[PDB]
Write an enzyme that holds these catalytic residues in place. Structure first.
Site, PDB file in Angstrom:
ATOM      1  N   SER A 200      37.718  91.404  42.760  1.00 26.69           N
ATOM      2  CA  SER A 200      37.706  91.917  44.135  1.00 26.69           C
ATOM      3  C   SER A 200      37.073  93.303  44.115  1.00 26.69           C
ATOM      4  O   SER A 200      35.903  93.418  43.707  1.00 26.69           O
ATOM      5  CB  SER A 200      39.119  91.840  44.713  1.00 26.69           C
ATOM      6  OG  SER A 200      39.099  92.000  46.123  1.00 26.69           O
ATOM      7  N   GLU A 331      38.029  81.526  49.141  1.00 31.28           N
ATOM      8  CA  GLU A 331      37.955  82.981  49.074  1.00 31.28           C
ATOM      9  C   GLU A 331      38.494  83.665  50.324  1.00 31.28           C
ATOM     10  O   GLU A 331      38.898  84.831  50.246  1.00 31.28           O
ATOM     11  CB  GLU A 331      36.507  83.421  48.837  1.00 31.28           C
ATOM     12  CG  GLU A 331      36.010  83.229  47.412  1.00 31.28           C
ATOM     13  CD  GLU A 331      36.624  84.221  46.440  1.00 31.28           C
ATOM     14  OE1 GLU A 331      36.532  83.992  45.216  1.00 31.28           O
ATOM     15  OE2 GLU A 331      37.198  85.230  46.900  1.00 31.28           O
ATOM     16  N   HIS A 444      42.179  84.007  47.190  1.00 35.97           N
ATOM     17  CA  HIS A 444      41.502  85.126  46.553  1.00 35.97           C
ATOM     18  C   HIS A 444      42.465  85.884  45.648  1.00 35.97           C
ATOM     19  O   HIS A 444      43.472  86.425  46.112  1.00 35.97           O
ATOM     20  CB  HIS A 444      40.940  86.046  47.638  1.00 35.97           C
ATOM     21  CG  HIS A 444      40.186  87.227  47.117  1.00 35.97           C
ATOM     22  ND1 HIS A 444      38.930  87.124  46.559  1.00 35.97           N
ATOM     23  CD2 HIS A 444      40.500  88.545  47.099  1.00 35.97           C
ATOM     24  CE1 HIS A 444      38.508  88.326  46.208  1.00 35.97           C
ATOM     25  NE2 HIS A 444      39.441  89.205  46.525  1.00 35.97           N
TER      26      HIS A 444
HETATM   27  C1  LIG Z   1      39.837  92.818  46.974  1.00 30.50           C
HETATM   28  C2  LIG Z   1      38.971  93.171  48.182  1.00 30.50           C
HETATM   29  O1  LIG Z   1      40.048  93.979  46.217  1.00 30.50           O
HETATM   30  C3  LIG Z   1      41.180  92.294  47.483  1.00 30.50           C
HETATM   31  C4  LIG Z   1      42.204  92.281  46.348  1.00 30.50           C
HETATM   32  C5  LIG Z   1      43.551  91.789  46.876  1.00 30.50           C
HETATM   33  N1  LIG Z   1      44.421  91.423  45.772  1.00 30.50           N
HETATM   34  C6  LIG Z   1      45.673  90.914  46.303  1.00 30.50           C
HETATM   35  C7  LIG Z   1      43.785  90.394  44.967  1.00 30.50           C
HETATM   36  C8  LIG Z   1      44.688  92.585  44.944  1.00 30.50           C
END
Ligand SMILES: *[C@](C)(O)CCC[N+](C)(C)C
Ligand SMILES: O/N=C/c1cc[n+](C[n+]2ccc(/C=N/O)cc2)cc1
Ligand SMILES: O/N=C/c1cc[n+](C[n+]2ccc(/C=N/O)cc2)cc1
Ligand SMILES: *[C@](C)(O)CCC[N+](C)(C)C
Lengths: 540, 540
Positions: A200, A331, A444
């Site tokens: 992410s 996603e 995700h």
């Molecule tokens: C990404 C945009 O960093 C979202 C991450 C969310 N978690 C729950 C996977 C940390």
């Protein structure tokens, strides 16, 4: 007395701790300070290297988590609490952790460096799901993970000024990478074989270090999981960053009534406010109702990022460089319960045609009504235009393709077509311990458990198949860190993982079944996002 | 002189001829004058009813074909020569033909009226593929077919003036329908059960009679074959018709400038020119290079068409009405050999991507570069974007959808959702005698020979299954003419043909195999044409 638990680095001495795994013990060094505490006048400033210390610093437990928003949408729910901080919040948080096999490898071992995600507003390296004791024991590698400042404390930018230049959270990661180059040999690690990998916002961070010359010379391989630096959420403009920073200052009483509003006095007023006061107004600076959008993200400032990520990816030479990119199956389903109308984790979320049309404006913010019309056209089953289950599945694909899948596919295409050897995957296994509803599929962020070997934990109710599946993935990631190739070098029997090219566009599916080669990373849907939609917005 | 070969109508007496079929004889009356010859000062004017005559008019052979362009693209080729005139060209051509069973039916029999296609510039009722001797013998129906003025002689319009009002070719069809109401009883036909059916421009003509009040009262059912009045080629604006008429006059020396100038002097000069002179410059008045576009077509004048076909379809009440719409599998392949670069009937037409991008501007003329980009996006297999075989089928689908399939589906949807009962089909059988290349599939216009029972001709080399397939199609069209339902009124063993509704969108496939119900007349592709693309042109 175990002698491998006391190591001397350039700053001083550390005392580690022995962790137990079902297959053997592992030496761990949790809470190594790699920078001075960025408190007081150091808030919003780039990090300074940690000064040498006297005595022995205790590295037997994780340190504090950087100040961040705490998710309270579903209190007590495992699916959200597993990402919330598990240590006390503090601006004194610039610490890293090192896992090394026991006994320490007598020869240099490749190093895996993990950068957590969390939309650049949350995250921590001490989360139980990021425990690197199983990956280090099974594959006998060296795993390092650091803490970087998130939110306003790491990405509030007043461009032009020196009191808040921005991207200091990325500088926290870079200083941690220089630390690995200067000290990982003391733990048995090879500083000439460093592999970054994140998920992410951590995957976007890995991509931004790939486009920055100073960070370029600190690692040799990269793994981007469900994220890319060219994503519409990963960066922000200098003008928008100034508006968000000034908006945050206004909500906390900066500047006082009757005082000028230059950058020096604005940051000086922000540095006097408590940390929790800035966090309470972090989400009130976003411009519109949206999902998968975050307040303070990296800024295109000409320093860390000389140009936009899209421009740097197009005009870049990536020869002699291996990348492992990939996404999960669903996603976008995770973010729909954070603002999309009609969506709830406690029911089937069978939205209507009207709610689906409203969700498109939330999932794709700041697009013309004509641009939103084109999204409805591509993502509508005109043979069943009112089917709630298909409209639910369509809006998840809208958010997933716009933010993750197509930004990733755009990156993987340019990397392979410009000298880099890339491998692509799609994680399609839904864990049996998943507490999210069934309609979310493989959400995700829920491949990290298997990459870190979490199913091997005896205290968890994973199945025997998922434990073997975890060891396969740990072998894939380790082989990529060792040889730049996820395929086993001494194995022609197992199914081969072919590289990803701009023409063939081959990838593999990761689940309980053996490897299956497929083609096209949603090529039909991503042609709309990466090719047609930019031209549609140019003509307004 | 058989008793049934002499029939008295309101104009006078007629002598017919007895034709022979493998299953029995049929009485035919070929060449009945239903209007005064539109020659001299009557050119461009609406038709006048045929005055009564003395003696016996010989109706034993087809009369003259209206003056029209003769296709010379492939001299000696059966595929194109079969549609060329098979009689002497002449402006004295307003004649109709009647086929009636032998012995003459003693009870009123439903009547089928055929209107030929040919892009409003060509066609004739005497073509071998329009022989109504097999349909009349097998199903004991009364088949009528007329000639109407095509090209400039039938559709040159100077809107506003009385010397060249336009749509007189449609008025030739209407006068033939009033003739059927006044004389079809003398042949055993029921004037209260008249079913119009036509193909291509004839199908569009059938649709325009549905949208004109004075023509609606002359028939009770309709069959639109690979055509619709709302097609982008079937009508032109009053301003474009004036420009095309003035350009045609300029190319033939009208007016002897600078004589001037108004419409009366312009038409007076056009009436002095030989008929062949006007034909030689018909194609030189088109505004752009394109396929499936014709010079002189019906014009939205406010008289015959009070508004545009699209407007009249939406705001129309069609209760108590049954239509039978349908298309062939490959509607656009026929027109590609008429101007798309890289296409030829004598090779595989494996075009490149450059030629595909050029053909899009020819297949979809007069659209913005952004609109062309949207068409390329939808009709590109983005995994094989340079495959010549896929680019060939894609350009055929572009032309087929833009001109036929989607205008038909648009009309079929609004027809069912506004009172009319609609049945839809897709003709997917390729005749074994087809002289066109294999890559064309089932081209536009090659279902007509099966509807007319042409495979029953013993002098032709059809297969045994194609003869049975022709008899099954003839029963379908006959049952629809008798009861308004293509299904047999009592046979339950044969598969059922479900109606077409705006929701389920059910149709059947017509081939050697039994009936197969499907859903969606290319709903995904036609949503782009019927919904998104109109809005894309509004915001230029
Ligand atoms: C990404 C945009 O960093 C979202 C991450 C969310 N978690 C729950 C996977 C940390
Ligand atoms: O009662 N109001 C609660 C509330 C306050 C502030 N927010 C902002 N916010 C947006 C998106 C997310 C998740 N992103 O993945 C997390 C937090 C949400 C809810
Ligand atoms: C000369 N010229 C141009 C185009 C065409 C097309 N016919 O369909 C015929 C003749
Ligand atoms: C249609 C537009 O009328 C074209 C008809 C072409 N033939 C060959 C089928 C007459």
């Amino acid at each position: 007395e175990d002698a491998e638990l006391l190591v001397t680095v350039r700053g001083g001495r550390l005392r580690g701790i022995r962790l137990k795994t079902p297959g053997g013990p592992v030496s761990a060094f949790l809470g190594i300070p790699f920078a001075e505490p960025p408190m007081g006048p150091r808030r919003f400033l780039p990090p300074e290297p940690k000064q040498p210390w006297s005595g022995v610093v205790d590295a037997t437990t994780f340190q504090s988590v950087c100040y961040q928003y705490v998710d309270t949408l579903y209190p007590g729910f495992e699916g959200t609490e597993m990402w919330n901080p598990n240590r006390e919040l503090s601006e004194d948080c610039l610490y890293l952790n090192v896992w090394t096999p026991y006994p320490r490898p007598t020869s240099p071992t490749p190093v895996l460096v993990w950068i957590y995600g969390g939309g650049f507003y949350s995250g921590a390296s001490s989360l139980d799901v990021y425990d690197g004791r199983f990956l280090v024991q099974a594959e006998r590698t060296v795993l390092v993970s650091m803490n970087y400042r998130v939110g306003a404390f790491g990405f509030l930018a007043l461009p032009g000024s020196r009191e808040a230049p921005g991207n200091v959270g990325l500088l926290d990661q870079r200083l941690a990478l220089q630390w690995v180059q200067e000290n990982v040999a003391a733990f048995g690690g090879d500083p000439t074989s460093v592999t970054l990998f994140g998920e992410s916002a951590g995957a976007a961070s890995v991509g931004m270090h790939l486009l920055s010359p100073p960070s370029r010379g600190l690692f040799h391989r990269a793994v981007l999981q469900s994220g890319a630096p060219n994503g519409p959420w990963a960066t922000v403009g200098m003008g928008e960053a100034r508006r968000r920073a000034t908006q945050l200052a206004h909500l906390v009483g900066c500047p006082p009534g009757g005082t000028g509003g230059n950058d020096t006095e604005l940051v000086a007023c922000l540095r006097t406010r408590p940390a929790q006061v800035l966090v309470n107004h972090e989400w009130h600076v976003l411009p519109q109702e949206s999902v998968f959008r975050f307040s303070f993200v990296p800024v295109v400032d000409g320093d860390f990022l000389s140009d936009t990520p899209e421009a740097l990816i197009n005009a870049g030479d990536f020869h002699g460089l291996q990348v492992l990119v990939g996404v999960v199956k669903d996603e976008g389903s995770y973010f729909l319960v954070y603002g999309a109308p009609g969506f709830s984790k406690d029911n089937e979320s069978l939205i209507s045609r009207a709610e689906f049309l409203a969700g498109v404006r939330v999932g794709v913010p700041q697009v013309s009504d004509l641009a939103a019309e084109a999204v409805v056209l591509h993502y509508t089953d005109w043979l069943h235009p009112e089917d709630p289950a298909r409209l639910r599945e369509a809006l998840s694909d809208v958010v997933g393709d716009h933010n993750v899948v197509c930004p990733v596919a755009q990156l993987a295409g340019r990397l392979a077509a410009q000298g880099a050897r890339v491998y692509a995957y799609v994680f399609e296994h839904r864990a049996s311990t998943l507490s999210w509803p069934l309609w979310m599929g493989v959400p995700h962020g829920y491949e990290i458990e298997f990459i870190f070997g979490i199913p091997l934990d005896p205290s968890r109710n994973y199945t025997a198949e998922e434990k073997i599946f975890a060891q396969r993935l740990m072998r894939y990631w380790a082989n990529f860190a060792r040889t730049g190739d996820p395929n086993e070098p001494r194995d022609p029997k197992a199914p081969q993982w072919p590289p990803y090219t701009a023409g063939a566009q081959q990838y593999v599916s990761l689940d309980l079944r053996p490897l299956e080669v497929r083609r096209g990373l949603r090529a039909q849907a991503c042609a709309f996002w990466n090719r047609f939609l930019p031209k549609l917005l140019s003509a307004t």
